[PDB]
Amino acid sequence: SMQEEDTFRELRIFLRNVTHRLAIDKRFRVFTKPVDPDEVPDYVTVIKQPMDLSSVISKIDLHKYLTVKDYLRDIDLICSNALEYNPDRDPGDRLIRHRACALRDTAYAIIKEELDEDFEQLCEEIQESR
């Protein structure tokens, strides 16, 4: 309905705002764009399902997220991909893992602080009725 398309538009506006706040944070620059095979050859062969914040923004604009949980699944994938690709004790690996955990925790804390829980439930219920 018109009331339902209004709800999904508000969700997209909200998810764009959260994603932008993540993307301008200097800690998360490694997560803002896809990994260049020129510069990281092993990546596209260790990580079967790439994800980054530019790809999240494109999915929002393609109406691919109908619930906050669907969005957080791709945030969780950015983080779990980073932990999986950087398992070593090397300080470079520990640094990326630290930032990956901070990206995940920051997204969750923004949602917990600023999203109404009745709003997420409305999104769920509209979606389960389709």
Whichever of 5 and 84 has its CB closer to ligand G7Q, that residue is 84
Q: Residue 95 Cβ, how far from ligand G7Q at the closest point, in Å?
A: 5
Site residues (vs ligand G7Q, CB under 6 A): 30, 35, 40, 82, 85-86, 88, 90, 92-93, 95-96
Q: Residue 78 Cβ, how far from ligand G7Q at the closest point, in Å?
A: 8
Whichever of 82 and 122 has its CB closer to ligand G7Q, that residue is 82
Q: Is-contact 58 19, C-beta < 8 A?
A: no
C-alpha–C-alpha distance, residues 20 and 128, integer Å? 28
C-alpha–C-alpha distance, residues 129 and 113, integer Å? 27
For residues 59-93, b (16+ Cβ closer than 10 Å) or e, as one string? bbeeeebbbbebbbebbebbbebbeebbeeeeeee
Q: Residue 64 Cβ, how far from ligand G7Q at the closest point, in Å?
A: 21
Whichever of 13 and 44 has its CB closer to ligand G7Q, that residue is 44
